[PDB]
Amino acid sequence: ALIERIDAIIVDLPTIQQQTLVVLRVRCSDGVEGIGEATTIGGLAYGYESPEGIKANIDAHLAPALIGLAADNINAAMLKLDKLAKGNTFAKSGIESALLDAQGKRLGLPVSELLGGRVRDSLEVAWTLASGDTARDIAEARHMLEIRRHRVFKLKIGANPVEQDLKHVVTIKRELGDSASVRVDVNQYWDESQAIRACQVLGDNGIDLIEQPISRINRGGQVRLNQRTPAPIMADESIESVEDAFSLAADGAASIFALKIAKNGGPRAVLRTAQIAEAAGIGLYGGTMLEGSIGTLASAHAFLTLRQLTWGTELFGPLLLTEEIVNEPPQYRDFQLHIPRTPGLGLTLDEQRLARFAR
Amino acid sequence: ALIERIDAIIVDLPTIQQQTLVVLRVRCSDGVEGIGEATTIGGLAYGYESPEGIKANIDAHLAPALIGLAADNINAAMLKLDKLAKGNTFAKSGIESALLDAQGKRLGLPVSELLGGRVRDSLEVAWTLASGDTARDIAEARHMLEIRRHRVFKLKIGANPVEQDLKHVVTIKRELGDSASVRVDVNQYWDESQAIRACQVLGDNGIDLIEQPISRINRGGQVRLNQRTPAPIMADESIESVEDAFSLAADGAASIFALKIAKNGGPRAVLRTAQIAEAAGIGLYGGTMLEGSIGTLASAHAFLTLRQLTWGTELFGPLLLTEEIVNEPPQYRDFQLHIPRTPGLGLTLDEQRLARFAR
Amino acid sequence: ALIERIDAIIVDLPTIQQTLVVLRVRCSDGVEGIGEATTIGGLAYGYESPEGIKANIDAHLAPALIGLAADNINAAMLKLDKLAKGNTFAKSGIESALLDAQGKRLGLPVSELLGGRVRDSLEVAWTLASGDTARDIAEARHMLEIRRHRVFKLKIGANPVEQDLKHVVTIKRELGDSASVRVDVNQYWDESQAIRACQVLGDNGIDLIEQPISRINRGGQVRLNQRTPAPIMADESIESVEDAFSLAADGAASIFALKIAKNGGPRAVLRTAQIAEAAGIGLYGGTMLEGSIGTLASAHAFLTLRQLTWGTELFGPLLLTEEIVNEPPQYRDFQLHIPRTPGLGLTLDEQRLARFAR
Amino acid sequence: ALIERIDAIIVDLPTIQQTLVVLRVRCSDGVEGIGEATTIGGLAYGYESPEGIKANIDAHLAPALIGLAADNINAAMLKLDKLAKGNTFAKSGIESALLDAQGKRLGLPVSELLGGRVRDSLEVAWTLASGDTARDIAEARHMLEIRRHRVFKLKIGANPVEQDLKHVVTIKRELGDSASVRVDVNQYWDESQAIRACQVLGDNGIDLIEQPISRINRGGQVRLNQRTPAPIMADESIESVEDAFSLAADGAASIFALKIAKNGGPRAVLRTAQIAEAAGIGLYGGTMLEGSIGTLASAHAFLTLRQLTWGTELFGPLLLTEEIVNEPPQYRDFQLHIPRTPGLGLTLDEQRLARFAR
């Protein structure tokens, strides 16, 4: 089987205002087509790759290089892209995901099987409390706990005065008590001078982990916080490649790594980061860039092969979408995401919805 | 335009007993004259440069080297002074300030514009509670808060027994509560054996940051305190040059840097320190050597170009003066210092007051 | 003066082809600023490709600046940093254009806007690219003859080590003291290969070794910086100003190559240059092979530096057969000469722009 | 397909004897996978001996896998990690057999199961073992003559330093550029001896120095990695994948020897290989002198690596006079050629298996 065609479609989907995704379709000579997803959050704010640049680069450089190569030699295809292109992990993630989807369908096996074999069939899924209103957040958390959908919550902070964000988080934790795990994500917003007292308060008031309190540019401060923060520090934005992860582990910059296929280069590349982490004794967390079912499931097939994910995952992207361009709704039940053992990613494109939302 | 003349005038001004300033006047061939200020605190106690030495060095070495050079090539003039003179940052600060003032007037642009462009028009201004009497300090702080002049206060400590200074500060903080930010400046007075418990008490009792607890000679202790003090440590006296700042950031000696044009070599030189800080993720604070409006405004035009100043500034020098040798009183209103977009520093000399206070 | 419109045009020029991205920033006061965001061969030398650069300027970068004050460049650039991470080549092209418009507006050269120059010309190196030893030596001798270049660079690492080594050493052997010979490995070797390679190179009079190993091996660069008999230069290890700080703090290189495209503009490159100065690191004016516009923006910044120990490699325009600029760069007596005219001192050749635009 | 039975058979083969442990994993779907757990001379080169390997597979390892899904190798291997610590040789033999059965099942070669190959053959070194200088040079010249090997390894450290040094240098002196000469000290020297030895070696064109000192001297390897003029290779310092991480984090070697037996299988060795790639470390395909089965399992993994700077030493089968496999390894033109047939592309020679089994 040879790679015959690769399409990159930008889609704008409505949310509970809209999430933009880059859907990849790779048609192989044997009639099999694989699908993948390259998604990011708000244009360029969460990465150098935007949906437009991703499409531009796939069309102009990445796809032309693969047409005519064997579909079933995923290693050769990706190694070729690395040689031709520096970075561009989001784009490479979608392509790898599509190639793995296609190979799974072709052999009748699920992607996790191609990746070695699963050790579980479901994954714990956290939930971001996003209203900004403390009371609403508490109400929402209790509701999600009642319907058994989530029991691990995450608050995004850093954009308001430190004391304001602190008050918010500590209040939600006191109210929920030991009924739920509460974590925070600062997304590099604080500088070390701010993080010093903040991490102390958070750690002292029951917050389980602090995700990326300061900027990736301050490597030394990450090492110091990793030694002094009462709550463990998780690296997210500091990881923009498998080599970054090695670098962070050697320095003792964090005790937990967020695993994101988009920042590593696909399902196989995230397993390298995970393995570097495992070799050094660093805890794992299944991360997301809020992708729909394709990218969420591609991430999921990889995480199912992992020995332990001490902190669970945050694969809730599909729950934020009102519409999807896939026909099979994901299974969220009893605090987890359940993954089928069907061929490939086990997804089928909703051609009607794809045409409607494509731009 | 060529630099035609440079005068260095020592002036003794009355305070709320007196502050000595070195006023610089640079006359260029096109009729434009720029003004600058080289000021220090109490002779030689806060630096190697005294008003007398500054005047001696400007007259004998620094000025002669610039006469006849182009007024509008500030980079060439300063680089020339560095080649001819080691250190002498206070003197160089006044000259740069005067050269930037002159160039701004010449092109009709404010100094901040020459420095790249402002991102704000006003700056938060802290206030030093100096009576030494706890009760008076509390009374003063409440008054300044009431008239909306200051909401960030700083206590200078280190000269009395540790417990005495500690009691003083903690009492002022308990009384003011969350209505004001309270910070301390030890000016290198403690040794590390003292700072260990002191920083712990201060940090535990609501003090936001500790400025220069120990001597610049103990680099290792600054690194340790930066890791163990509950409240972030700010470097001030450890910075006597742009290279010192780089050195301190590489060592992880402090999480905040006080920015002073006098200790760096002028407005442009302080931007280098700030940039080294920004590149390493270190927080910034706009410092002062208690200069009048000229040096305060020269400092201000530089700080307005900075992305963030997590800790505000302490540009309150003019408020301590009963008389000034400048005609335009500075704008302090609603907790801040407001900076005009007028040419140069936007100041004019009060020739009558200058003649009267010159010595 | 407000920013009214920003045009990003992809142009393919023939070489002795090179794809450039030309920026045109028109301001409400009638002043137009021009800039250039250029890379080498698609995505092989950076994360940005001409197509992605344009896509991003058109969809994100430019929209954020329309209506802003054209004269407050710091404010404009700080806005792009907030809306987009990375994207240094695009950001560089935009800043260059702003500084150009501002120079024209004030009737001052970009170098003055950046503080004031300390020199009027920069030493320029030349890359011997035939791949043939006799041919390279003949080319170098010629450049030396016409007094155009006396510093030559050799791109190696893509052939068996011993071959590349034999090549470089022969060239230096033949030229001797008449020239300065340097190599650029562009991250091709691994530490195990560079150990002996660096030793051999240094022992044979090569002045410097540019980026021998990959930026991913920080410990190796630190080791090579301490053991290589010839100084190690960082190039690809620098992808932002903070990287420069990081490398400096680690003692990973004794020389930093300075490229506006990799840092984000003539101002961002000065931040990198100053961090290096504060640490005692040697400087080198680098290039991404841009035409005159990009080369001149780089130049105006390099003219303000107290010292460029290893000179520059701003020979970019020389590789081109045609330019979309009206003023050809002045290359004479081993150097590039920069006028004191307003802005970048360049104007668009509308006719040729339309011809090579795509 | 479930795992139905696992047989571990000790076989002694004559050499130009070597004891191997052959694994036969039979699955419920009729597919049989074969593997090999081999070490050199009892317990002198590892913690596992043929007798202990068998004892442990029979009493612990195998019982835990009976009934499990044959096609979920990761799940099976993670089970062994939990029930038994260490035991990499046994674990390696088992994984090799599973991958073989899975390749046969799917009709795909093991290299494809591991991701897909980037080459069809691997460069193979040869160990000159007569111990006699003239004899070694004659042997090397011959291998070069028949185009079988051009890279030779010399095992030293068991004689007075000056003697061993004199030996190696003479061989390199005589062969010159016609060949790549390397040494393996197998932890024989102490740091005080390696200081001068490494210097002399490097000065005389030896390409690399494999494991000069003991894994117990971490600081020394870090020092030797910074001072030795020739690159230092880690072999015995690697006894698990985590060790590889540790050595990489410390900057203890610039090259890692890759051996499935020391890491735990073709998959475990890829984990080690990738940690090395992430750090900029050079790779070398190593061996524990296994016959075709072990050599092929190693090979299929090495074919997926982007780069093996120093080649391999998969000459194991060549040392044997008889094999219990039906397909002889294809050694030609300095390399080992690996087919694309299902699994390891090998089948058991039942007749010979029974003859040499013990």
Side-chain angles (χ1 to χ4, degrees), chain B residues 72-76 79 103 107 109 113 116-119 242-243 246 249-250 272 275-276 279-280 305, chain C residues 71-75 78 102 106 108 112 115-118 242 245 248-249 271 274-275 278-279 304:
Chain B
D72 57 325
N73 193 325
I74 301 179
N75 185 213
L79 236 29
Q103 177 81 329
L107 271 35
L109 320 166
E113 227 271 57
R118 68 184 56 204
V119 298
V242 177
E243 298 82 1
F246 168 81
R272 276 178 249 141
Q275 285 156 179
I276 283 177
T305 71
Chain C
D71 56 330
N72 187 333
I73 301 177
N74 179 233
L78 256 19
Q102 187 69 9
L106 264 44
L108 295 182
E112 184 169 350
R117 73 185 57 195
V118 292
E242 19 282 333
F245 169 81
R271 258 178 261 140
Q274 48 195 254
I275 286 163
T304 70

Short mmCIF file of all heavy atoms in Angstrom, two decimals, chain B residues 72-76 79 103 107 109 113 116-119 242-243 246 249-250 272 275-276 279-280 305, chain C residues 71-75 78 102 106 108 112 115-118 242 245 248-249 271 274-275 278-279 304:
data_model
loop_
_atom_site.label_atom_id
_atom_site.label_comp_id
_atom_site.label_asym_id
_atom_site.label_seq_id
_atom_site.Cartn_x
_atom_site.Cartn_y
_atom_site.Cartn_z
N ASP B 72 23.43 63.68 18.62
CA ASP B 72 22.44 62.66 18.32
C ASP B 72 22.94 61.22 18.20
O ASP B 72 22.18 60.33 17.80
CB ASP B 72 21.61 63.08 17.10
CG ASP B 72 22.45 63.35 15.86
OD1 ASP B 72 23.59 63.86 16.00
OD2 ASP B 72 21.97 63.06 14.75
N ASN B 73 24.22 60.98 18.48
CA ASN B 73 24.71 59.61 18.43
C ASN B 73 25.01 59.26 19.88
O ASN B 73 26.15 59.31 20.34
CB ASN B 73 25.95 59.43 17.54
CG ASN B 73 26.24 57.95 17.26
OD1 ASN B 73 26.03 57.08 18.11
ND2 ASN B 73 26.70 57.65 16.05
N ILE B 74 23.95 58.93 20.61
CA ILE B 74 24.06 58.61 22.01
C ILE B 74 24.86 57.33 22.25
O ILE B 74 25.69 57.26 23.17
CB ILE B 74 22.67 58.57 22.64
CG1 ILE B 74 22.03 59.95 22.45
CG2 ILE B 74 22.75 58.15 24.11
CD1 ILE B 74 20.62 60.08 22.98
N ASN B 75 24.66 56.34 21.39
CA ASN B 75 25.38 55.09 21.51
C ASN B 75 26.90 55.32 21.44
O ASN B 75 27.64 54.86 22.31
CB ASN B 75 24.96 54.12 20.41
CG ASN B 75 25.60 52.75 20.57
OD1 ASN B 75 25.90 52.06 19.58
ND2 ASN B 75 25.80 52.34 21.82
N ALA B 76 27.37 56.08 20.45
CA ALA B 76 28.80 56.35 20.32
C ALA B 76 29.38 57.10 21.51
O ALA B 76 30.47 56.76 22.00
CB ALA B 76 29.08 57.09 19.03
N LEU B 79 29.51 54.67 24.66
CA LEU B 79 30.48 53.61 24.45
C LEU B 79 31.89 54.22 24.64
O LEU B 79 32.79 53.59 25.22
CB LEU B 79 30.29 53.06 23.04
CG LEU B 79 30.04 51.56 22.81
CD1 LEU B 79 29.33 50.92 23.98
CD2 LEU B 79 29.23 51.40 21.57
N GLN B 103 18.01 65.12 22.71
CA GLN B 103 17.57 64.48 21.47
C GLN B 103 16.04 64.49 21.36
O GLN B 103 15.48 64.67 20.28
CB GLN B 103 18.16 63.07 21.38
CG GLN B 103 17.73 62.24 20.19
CD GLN B 103 18.50 62.56 18.92
OE1 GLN B 103 18.94 63.70 18.69
NE2 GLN B 103 18.67 61.54 18.07
N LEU B 107 13.86 66.35 18.31
CA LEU B 107 12.97 65.63 17.40
C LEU B 107 11.50 65.79 17.76
O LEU B 107 10.63 65.24 17.08
CB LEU B 107 13.33 64.13 17.38
CG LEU B 107 14.38 63.59 16.39
CD1 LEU B 107 15.48 64.58 16.12
CD2 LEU B 107 14.95 62.28 16.90
N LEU B 109 10.01 64.53 20.36
CA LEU B 109 9.47 63.30 20.94
C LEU B 109 9.87 63.11 22.40
O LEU B 109 10.92 63.61 22.84
CB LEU B 109 9.99 62.08 20.16
CG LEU B 109 10.09 62.17 18.63
CD1 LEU B 109 10.93 61.01 18.12
CD2 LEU B 109 8.70 62.20 17.99
N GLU B 113 9.77 57.43 23.90
CA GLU B 113 9.58 57.21 22.47
C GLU B 113 10.93 56.86 21.88
O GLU B 113 11.02 55.98 21.04
CB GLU B 113 9.08 58.50 21.81
CG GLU B 113 7.89 58.36 20.87
CD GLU B 113 8.27 58.06 19.43
OE1 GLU B 113 8.96 57.05 19.18
OE2 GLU B 113 7.82 58.81 18.54
N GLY B 116 11.96 53.36 22.49
CA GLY B 116 11.14 52.31 21.90
C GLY B 116 9.65 52.58 21.86
O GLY B 116 8.99 52.24 20.88
N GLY B 117 9.11 53.18 22.91
CA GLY B 117 7.69 53.47 22.98
C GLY B 117 7.11 52.94 24.28
O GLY B 117 7.41 51.83 24.68
N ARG B 118 6.26 53.75 24.91
CA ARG B 118 5.63 53.40 26.18
C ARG B 118 4.48 52.42 26.00
O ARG B 118 3.85 52.35 24.94
CB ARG B 118 5.11 54.67 26.86
CG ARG B 118 3.92 55.31 26.13
CD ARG B 118 3.45 56.62 26.75
NE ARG B 118 4.53 57.59 26.83
CZ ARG B 118 4.55 58.60 27.69
NH1 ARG B 118 3.55 58.77 28.55
NH2 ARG B 118 5.62 59.38 27.77
N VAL B 119 4.20 51.66 27.05
CA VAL B 119 3.08 50.71 27.03
C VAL B 119 2.12 51.06 28.16
O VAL B 119 1.14 50.38 28.41
CB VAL B 119 3.54 49.23 27.07
CG1 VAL B 119 4.37 48.92 25.83
CG2 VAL B 119 4.35 48.94 28.29
N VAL B 242 25.36 46.34 34.63
CA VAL B 242 24.56 45.43 33.82
C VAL B 242 25.12 43.99 33.92
O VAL B 242 24.37 43.02 34.02
CB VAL B 242 24.58 45.90 32.34
CG1 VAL B 242 23.81 44.93 31.45
CG2 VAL B 242 24.01 47.33 32.24
N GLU B 243 26.44 43.88 34.01
CA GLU B 243 27.08 42.57 34.08
C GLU B 243 26.82 41.86 35.40
O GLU B 243 26.76 40.63 35.45
CB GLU B 243 28.57 42.70 33.81
CG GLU B 243 28.87 43.23 32.40
CD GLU B 243 28.79 44.75 32.28
OE1 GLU B 243 28.51 45.43 33.29
OE2 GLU B 243 29.01 45.27 31.17
N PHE B 246 23.48 40.16 35.07
CA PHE B 246 23.57 38.90 34.33
C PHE B 246 24.09 37.83 35.26
O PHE B 246 23.55 36.71 35.30
CB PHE B 246 24.53 38.98 33.12
CG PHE B 246 24.86 37.63 32.53
CD1 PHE B 246 23.98 36.99 31.66
CD2 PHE B 246 26.02 36.95 32.91
CE1 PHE B 246 24.26 35.70 31.18
CE2 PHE B 246 26.30 35.66 32.44
CZ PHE B 246 25.42 35.04 31.58
N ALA B 249 21.49 36.66 37.76
CA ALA B 249 20.42 35.86 37.16
C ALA B 249 20.90 34.45 36.86
O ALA B 249 20.17 33.48 37.05
CB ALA B 249 19.91 36.52 35.92
N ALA B 250 22.15 34.32 36.40
CA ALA B 250 22.70 33.01 36.08
C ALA B 250 22.85 32.14 37.32
O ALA B 250 22.76 30.92 37.23
CB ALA B 250 24.03 33.16 35.39
N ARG B 272 18.96 47.45 29.60
CA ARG B 272 19.75 46.22 29.37
C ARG B 272 19.56 45.29 30.56
O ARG B 272 19.32 44.10 30.39
CB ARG B 272 21.22 46.54 29.21
CG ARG B 272 21.60 46.95 27.83
CD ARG B 272 23.06 47.28 27.77
NE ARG B 272 23.19 48.72 27.56
CZ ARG B 272 24.10 49.48 28.14
NH1 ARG B 272 24.98 48.95 28.99
NH2 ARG B 272 24.15 50.78 27.85
N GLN B 275 16.17 43.84 30.46
CA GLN B 275 16.09 42.82 29.41
C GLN B 275 16.77 41.50 29.79
O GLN B 275 16.30 40.41 29.44
CB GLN B 275 16.60 43.39 28.09
CG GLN B 275 15.60 44.37 27.44
CD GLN B 275 16.24 45.39 26.49
OE1 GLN B 275 15.54 46.22 25.88
NE2 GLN B 275 17.55 45.34 26.36
N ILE B 276 17.84 41.59 30.56
CA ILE B 276 18.52 40.40 31.03
C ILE B 276 17.56 39.72 31.99
O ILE B 276 17.41 38.50 31.98
CB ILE B 276 19.83 40.77 31.75
CG1 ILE B 276 20.91 41.12 30.73
CG2 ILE B 276 20.26 39.65 32.70
CD1 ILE B 276 22.20 41.56 31.38
N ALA B 279 14.63 38.10 30.09
CA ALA B 279 15.08 36.87 29.43
C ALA B 279 15.19 35.68 30.38
O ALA B 279 15.09 34.52 29.95
CB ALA B 279 16.41 37.11 28.73
N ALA B 280 15.40 35.96 31.67
CA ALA B 280 15.53 34.90 32.65
C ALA B 280 14.28 34.69 33.50
O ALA B 280 14.27 33.80 34.34
CB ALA B 280 16.74 35.15 33.54
N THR B 305 8.55 51.67 29.14
CA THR B 305 8.73 50.80 27.98
C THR B 305 8.71 49.30 28.35
O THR B 305 8.60 48.42 27.48
CB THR B 305 10.05 51.18 27.20
OG1 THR B 305 11.21 50.80 27.95
CG2 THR B 305 10.12 52.68 27.00
N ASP C 71 4.44 54.70 15.04
CA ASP C 71 5.65 55.19 15.69
C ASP C 71 5.99 54.58 17.04
O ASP C 71 7.04 54.89 17.60
CB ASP C 71 5.63 56.72 15.76
CG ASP C 71 4.40 57.28 16.47
OD1 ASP C 71 3.31 56.67 16.41
OD2 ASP C 71 4.51 58.38 17.07
N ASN C 72 5.10 53.74 17.59
CA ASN C 72 5.38 53.10 18.87
C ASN C 72 5.58 51.63 18.53
O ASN C 72 4.66 50.82 18.60
CB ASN C 72 4.22 53.28 19.84
CG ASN C 72 4.53 52.78 21.23
OD1 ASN C 72 5.35 51.88 21.42
ND2 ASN C 72 3.87 53.36 22.21
N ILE C 73 6.82 51.32 18.15
CA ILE C 73 7.21 50.00 17.74
C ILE C 73 7.27 49.01 18.89
O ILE C 73 6.88 47.85 18.76
CB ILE C 73 8.57 50.08 17.02
CG1 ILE C 73 8.44 51.00 15.80
CG2 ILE C 73 9.11 48.68 16.67
CD1 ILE C 73 9.74 51.21 15.05
N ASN C 74 7.79 49.46 20.03
CA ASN C 74 7.85 48.59 21.18
C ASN C 74 6.42 48.11 21.51
O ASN C 74 6.17 46.90 21.61
CB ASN C 74 8.49 49.32 22.36
CG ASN C 74 8.56 48.46 23.59
OD1 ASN C 74 8.11 48.86 24.67
ND2 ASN C 74 9.10 47.27 23.45
N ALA C 75 5.46 49.04 21.57
CA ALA C 75 4.07 48.68 21.88
C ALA C 75 3.53 47.70 20.85
O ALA C 75 2.89 46.72 21.22
CB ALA C 75 3.17 49.91 21.95
N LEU C 78 5.28 44.20 21.35
CA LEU C 78 4.85 43.56 22.57
C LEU C 78 3.44 42.99 22.38
O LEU C 78 3.05 42.04 23.05
CB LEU C 78 4.88 44.55 23.73
CG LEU C 78 6.05 44.41 24.72
CD1 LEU C 78 7.19 43.63 24.14
CD2 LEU C 78 6.50 45.78 25.15
N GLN C 102 9.62 54.34 10.26
CA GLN C 102 9.95 55.32 11.29
C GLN C 102 11.21 56.11 10.91
O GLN C 102 11.30 57.32 11.18
CB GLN C 102 10.06 54.64 12.66
CG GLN C 102 10.23 55.60 13.85
CD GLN C 102 8.98 56.44 14.16
OE1 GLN C 102 7.90 56.21 13.60
NE2 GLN C 102 9.13 57.40 15.07
N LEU C 106 11.10 60.21 10.38
CA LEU C 106 12.00 61.12 11.09
C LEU C 106 13.21 61.56 10.28
O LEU C 106 13.99 62.40 10.73
CB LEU C 106 12.48 60.43 12.39
CG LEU C 106 11.79 60.67 13.74
CD1 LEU C 106 10.29 60.63 13.61
CD2 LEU C 106 12.30 59.64 14.73
N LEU C 108 15.79 59.69 9.58
CA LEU C 108 16.96 59.14 10.24
C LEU C 108 17.15 57.69 9.82
O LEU C 108 16.18 56.99 9.53
CB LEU C 108 16.76 59.11 11.76
CG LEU C 108 16.62 60.39 12.58
CD1 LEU C 108 16.47 60.02 14.06
CD2 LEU C 108 17.84 61.26 12.35
N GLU C 112 20.45 54.80 13.62
CA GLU C 112 20.34 55.90 14.57
C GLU C 112 19.17 55.68 15.51
O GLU C 112 19.28 55.93 16.71
CB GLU C 112 20.19 57.25 13.86
CG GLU C 112 20.19 58.43 14.84
CD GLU C 112 20.31 59.77 14.16
OE1 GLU C 112 20.60 59.82 12.94
OE2 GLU C 112 20.14 60.80 14.86
N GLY C 115 19.97 53.70 18.34
CA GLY C 115 20.98 54.21 19.24
C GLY C 115 22.12 55.00 18.63
O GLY C 115 22.66 55.88 19.29
N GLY C 116 22.51 54.68 17.39
CA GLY C 116 23.63 55.37 16.77
C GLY C 116 24.74 54.40 16.43
O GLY C 116 25.08 53.53 17.24
N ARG C 117 25.29 54.51 15.22
CA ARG C 117 26.34 53.60 14.76
C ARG C 117 27.71 53.94 15.29
O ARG C 117 27.99 55.09 15.63
CB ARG C 117 26.44 53.62 13.22
CG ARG C 117 27.06 54.91 12.64
CD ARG C 117 27.06 54.98 11.09
NE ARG C 117 25.71 54.85 10.55
CZ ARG C 117 25.41 54.58 9.28
NH1 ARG C 117 26.38 54.41 8.38
NH2 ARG C 117 24.14 54.42 8.91
N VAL C 118 28.57 52.92 15.35
CA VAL C 118 29.95 53.12 15.76
C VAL C 118 30.89 52.76 14.60
O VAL C 118 32.12 52.77 14.78
CB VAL C 118 30.33 52.31 17.01
CG1 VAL C 118 29.59 52.84 18.23
CG2 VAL C 118 30.07 50.85 16.77
N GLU C 242 15.79 34.44 24.91
CA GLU C 242 15.96 33.65 26.15
C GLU C 242 16.92 32.48 25.99
O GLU C 242 17.59 32.09 26.95
CB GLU C 242 14.62 33.12 26.68
CG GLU C 242 13.53 33.10 25.65
CD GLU C 242 12.94 34.47 25.44
OE1 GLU C 242 13.01 35.28 26.37
OE2 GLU C 242 12.44 34.73 24.34
N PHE C 245 20.22 33.67 26.54
CA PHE C 245 20.52 33.81 27.97
C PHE C 245 20.91 32.46 28.57
O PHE C 245 21.87 32.36 29.33
CB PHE C 245 19.34 34.40 28.76
CG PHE C 245 19.53 34.30 30.26
CD1 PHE C 245 20.31 35.23 30.94
CD2 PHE C 245 19.02 33.20 30.97
CE1 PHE C 245 20.60 35.06 32.30
CE2 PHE C 245 19.30 33.03 32.32
CZ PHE C 245 20.09 33.96 32.98
N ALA C 248 24.28 31.28 27.50
CA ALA C 248 25.29 32.10 28.16
C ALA C 248 25.46 31.64 29.60
O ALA C 248 26.57 31.45 30.07
CB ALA C 248 24.90 33.57 28.10
N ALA C 249 24.34 31.42 30.29
CA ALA C 249 24.39 31.00 31.67
C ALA C 249 25.07 29.63 31.83
O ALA C 249 25.72 29.37 32.84
CB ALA C 249 23.01 30.97 32.24
N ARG C 271 19.00 42.64 21.83
CA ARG C 271 18.79 42.10 23.16
C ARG C 271 19.72 40.87 23.31
O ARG C 271 20.41 40.72 24.31
CB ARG C 271 17.35 41.64 23.32
CG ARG C 271 16.48 42.59 24.08
CD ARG C 271 15.06 42.10 24.14
NE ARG C 271 14.27 42.78 23.14
CZ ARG C 271 13.33 42.20 22.40
NH1 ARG C 271 13.07 40.91 22.55
NH2 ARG C 271 12.68 42.92 21.48
N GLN C 274 23.31 42.05 23.49
CA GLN C 274 23.70 42.63 24.76
C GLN C 274 23.85 41.62 25.90
O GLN C 274 24.75 41.78 26.76
CB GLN C 274 22.85 43.85 25.14
CG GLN C 274 21.36 43.67 25.02
CD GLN C 274 20.61 45.00 25.06
OE1 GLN C 274 19.98 45.33 26.06
NE2 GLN C 274 20.68 45.77 23.97
N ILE C 275 23.03 40.57 25.90
CA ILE C 275 23.15 39.51 26.91
C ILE C 275 24.54 38.88 26.76
O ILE C 275 25.24 38.64 27.76
CB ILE C 275 22.08 38.43 26.71
CG1 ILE C 275 20.73 38.96 27.14
CG2 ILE C 275 22.41 37.20 27.52
CD1 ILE C 275 19.58 38.17 26.63
N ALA C 278 27.25 41.21 28.09
CA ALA C 278 27.23 41.17 29.55
C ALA C 278 27.92 39.93 30.11
O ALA C 278 28.34 39.93 31.27
CB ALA C 278 25.78 41.24 30.07
N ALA C 279 28.05 38.89 29.29
CA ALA C 279 28.66 37.64 29.70
C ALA C 279 30.08 37.41 29.17
O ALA C 279 30.71 36.41 29.54
CB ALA C 279 27.77 36.48 29.27
N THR C 304 25.67 49.19 15.48
CA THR C 304 25.62 49.79 16.82
C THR C 304 26.40 49.00 17.87
O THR C 304 26.54 49.46 19.00
CB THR C 304 24.15 49.94 17.33
OG1 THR C 304 23.60 48.64 17.61
CG2 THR C 304 23.29 50.63 16.30
#
